[PDB]
Amino acid sequence: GVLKIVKVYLAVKRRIQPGDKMAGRHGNKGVISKINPIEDMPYDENGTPV
Amino acid sequence: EIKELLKLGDLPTSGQIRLYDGRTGEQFERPVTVGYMYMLKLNHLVDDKM
Amino acid sequence: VTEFLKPRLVDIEQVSSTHAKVTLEPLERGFGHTLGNALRRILLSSMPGCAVTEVEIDGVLHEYSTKEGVQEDILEILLNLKGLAVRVQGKDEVILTLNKSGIGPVTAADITHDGDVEIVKPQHVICHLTDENASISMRIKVQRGRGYVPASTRIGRLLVDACYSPVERIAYNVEAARVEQRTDLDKLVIEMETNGTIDPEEAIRRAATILAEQLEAFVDPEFDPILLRPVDDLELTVRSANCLKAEAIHYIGDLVQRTEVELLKTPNLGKKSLTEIKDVLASRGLSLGMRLENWPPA
Amino acid sequence: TEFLKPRLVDIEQVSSTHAKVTLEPLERGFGHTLGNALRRILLSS
Amino acid sequence: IHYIGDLVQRTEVELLKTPNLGKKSLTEIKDVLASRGLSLGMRLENWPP
Amino acid sequence: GPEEITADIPNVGEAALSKLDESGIVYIGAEVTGGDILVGKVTPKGETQL
């Protein structure tokens, strides 16, 4: 019954956003709640932000 | 041994450092532990689930 | 009624080509952190800089492709191009050409020397050509902008995530200033770690300029829409479109006003073209010699 | 290159000597910047 | 015609006047050019700098 | 009757058909977004008097 079949392979890249789920190897898991700009981030004395 | 590696690293032995709030500039009233943790992004992404 | 002491750039200690220490000589106590945070906040996000936004590599169509004779795939190449530090004279868009054949690393030094464009780090690796019959030819578009504008913020041409901000890291110290006068004065020492695209002093004056400009005081349907569509929406032949545009007909509204007589009087429009135009216009309920009276409103 | 500058204002007079004035448009990171700058000036200068 | 710029200058008529390009091929060219926002008979006036 | 994969689709503009080849299948390298056509296909109408 089938005349022709077409398969189209599409590829997408996804950047981390609010709502994505991240975790560590120790059972510490959680969802991203906020993406705050670099200047608002807590930083070390030498200016390096976390 | 971690204390030793922190000593070549130049410490704090506890692993807590003074941290400045990016919005104010005021230091947080207590020393805060900061370090590189290995974190994974899980297969659950908002884009798929919403 | 004690007049205030106003800050002035007094020192520049270039630790390196991309690391500096700018200090302000006069400050009243408690003003160190205010300017420190204001300036760090402006610098870390509101600085203007050049960044690669598009790339056109030969033989490559999509960024997921890999090229014959190149070690790393196109993605890695673009990812390398994100880190291309460029200083452009006086332009908001520049095209760089990169032609390179041979074996070994293809660095930013192999990019065709343009008079305006200044390359901060010529030893910055963009590629690695393996065999001696391999060669790459690409066109890197560099633009001026602000903040982080991803490629997802929308031809066989690739797009690259734009990292416009020239500043990587900022730090500041309040440190008590000397001087016998007043004694209770401080000096703001800003340790800056930029990409070398912009000089420390102008960055400071630009952050302050932005801040000052922000502080600018405290005060206190009729007719058919189809007529304003471009002629390209009619999907005519290239010839007819170019002819119409040459006759100052850029929109459908302009076309529907013209008559057959007037159109045939043009230097480039034959009977075939007119037949086509009448056909495509009739196909959408339109025609020539249409009166809409009031061209145009606003 | 131009930035978004304030437009449209509002003043909520909670009382005769207590008010709330707000600036409608600002770029991100400027809320805490002008907020802390102004709070630091107002609370001491 | 070695480059896209060379192709976009030619018109359908002229290409059909060439010894080796038929209408199937020309249609193909129109499709692939349309797929990239390009076309035949494109004027760039100043070829080349 | 047979369903056909074709570039000819009822009431579709060239803008929508821009990224489709002669056959009716999108050309490799094209950027597609939600709603865009990947493969053009027509099915015989059961037909109804309008």
Encoded tokens for E42: 């494109």
Residues B3 and B19: their CA atoms lie apart, in Å, by: 20
CB C46 within 8 A of CB C170: no
Cα C249 → chain centroid: 32
Q: Is C235 left (phi over 0), alpha (psi -120 to 50) or beta?
A: left
Residues F6 and C297: their CA atoms lie apart, in Å, by: 43
Nearest to D38 by CA among C184, C35, C220: C35
CB C34 within 8 A of CB C155: no
Residues C258 and C231: their CA atoms lie apart, in Å, by: 14
Please name the helix (run of DSSP H) or strand (run of DSSP E) that holds residue C205, with its range, or none.
Answer: helix C200-214
> What contacts F47, CB < 8 A, 6 or more positions away?
none
> What contacts C275, CB < 8 A, 6 or more positions away?
none
Helix (H, G, I), strand (E, B) or coil at D36: helix
Query: β-strand C125-129 against C93-101: which pairing, if any?
Result: unpaired
CB B23 within 8 A of CB B4: no
CB C206 within 8 A of CB E7: no
Residues C9 and B46: their CA atoms lie apart, in Å, by: 48
Closest-CA residue of chain D to B25: D36
> E strands of chain C, at which residues?
9-12, 19-28, 48-57, 86-87, 93-101, 104-107, 118-119, 125-129, 135-146, 148-149, 158-159, 162-163, 167-173, 185-194
Residues C45 and F46: their CA atoms lie apart, in Å, by: 60
Nearest to E41 by CA among F34, C254, C246: C246
Encoded tokens for C6: 């106003």
Q: Which amino acid is at D18?
A: H
Nearest to C51 by CA among C206, C126, C162: C162
Query: Which residues of chain E make contact with C238, given a CB cutoff of 8 A?
Result: 11, 39-42
Helix axes C200-214, C32-43, angle to 10 degrees: 100
Domain C1-48+165-218: assigned CATH number = 3.30.1360.10
Can you give the resolution of this entry in Å?
A: 3.9
Query: β-strand C125-129 against C158-159: which pairing, if any?
Result: unpaired
Q: Which amino acid is at C155?
A: I
CB contact under 8 A, A47 and C40: yes
Residues C240 and C273: their CA atoms lie apart, in Å, by: 6
Cα C146 → chain centroid: 8
Residue A13 backbone dihedrals phi, psi, to 5 degrees: -110, 130
Q: How far is E32 from chain F (nearest CA, A)?
A: 7
Residue of D23, D40, D42, D43 best to disrupt the C interface, most CBs of C under 10 A: D40
Chain A residues contacting D, CB < 8 Å? 37, 39-40
Domain C237-298: assigned CATH number = 1.10.150.20
Q: How far is E25 from chain F (nearest CA, A)?
A: 11
CB C156 within 8 A of CB C114: no
Residue ranges of chain C assigned to CATH 1.10.150.20: 237-298
Residues A42 and B22: their CA atoms lie apart, in Å, by: 5
Encoded tokens for C19: 């690391």
Residues D43 and D38: their CA atoms lie apart, in Å, by: 8
Range C193-229 burial, b when 16+ CB lie within 10 A, else e: bbbbbbebeebbebbbebbeebeeeeeeeeeeeebee
CB C246 within 8 A of CB C209: no
Residue of C170, C172, C174, C211 best to disrupt the A interface, most CBs of A under 10 A: C170
Residues C221 and C292: their CA atoms lie apart, in Å, by: 14
Query: Which residues of chain C make contact with F32, given a CB cutoff of 8 A?
Result: none
Residues C134 and C102: their CA atoms lie apart, in Å, by: 6
Residue ranges of chain C assigned to CATH 2.170.120.12: 49-164
Query: β-strand C167-173 against C9-12: which pairing, if any?
Result: unpaired
Encoded tokens for C136: 């790459």
CB C161 within 8 A of CB C51: no
Chain B residues contacting C, CB < 8 Å? 22-26
Residues C222 and C224: their CA atoms lie apart, in Å, by: 7
CB contact under 8 A, C36 and B24: no
- Which homologous superfamily is C49-164 in? DNA-directed RNA polymerase, insert domain (2.170.120.12)
CB B30 within 8 A of CB B44: no
Residue ranges of chain C assigned to CATH 3.30.1360.10: 1-48+165-218
The Cβ of residue F33 has, within 10 Å, a number of other Cβ atoms equal to 6
Residues C41 and C44: their CA atoms lie apart, in Å, by: 5
Helix (H, G, I), strand (E, B) or coil at C151: coil
Exposed (0-12), middle (13-18) or buried (19+): which is F5, by Cβ within 10 Å? middle
Method: X-ray
Pairs from A44-49 (Cβ < 8 Å, separation ≥ 24)? A44/B17, A44/B18, A44/B19, A44/B20, A44/B34, A45/B17, A45/B18, A45/B20, A45/C171, A46/C171, A46/C191, A47/C40, A47/C169, A47/C170, A47/C171, A47/C172, A47/C191, A47/C193, A48/C169, A48/C171, A49/B22
Q: Which amino acid is at A49?
A: P
Residues C88 and C197: their CA atoms lie apart, in Å, by: 9
Cα F1 → chain centroid: 18
> What contacts F40, CB < 8 A, 6 or more positions away?
F5, F6, F7, F8, F9, F17, F20, F24, F25
Nearest to A47 by CA among B18, F21, E17: B18
The angle at the Cα of B3, spanning A50 to B4, to the nearest 5 degrees, equals 115
The Cβ of residue F1 has, within 10 Å, a number of other Cβ atoms equal to 6
Residues C42 and C215: their CA atoms lie apart, in Å, by: 13
Encoded tokens for D33: 């910047």
Nearest to C243 by CA among C220, C210, C265: C265
Q: Is F17 left (phi over 0), alpha (psi -120 to 50) or beta?
A: alpha
CB C177 within 8 A of CB C192: no
Query: Which residues of chain C make contact with B19, given a CB cutoff of 8 A?
Result: none
- Which homologous superfamily is E1-49 in? 5' to 3' exonuclease, C-terminal subdomain (1.10.150.20)
Exposed (0-12), middle (13-18) or buried (19+): which is B20, by Cβ within 10 Å? buried
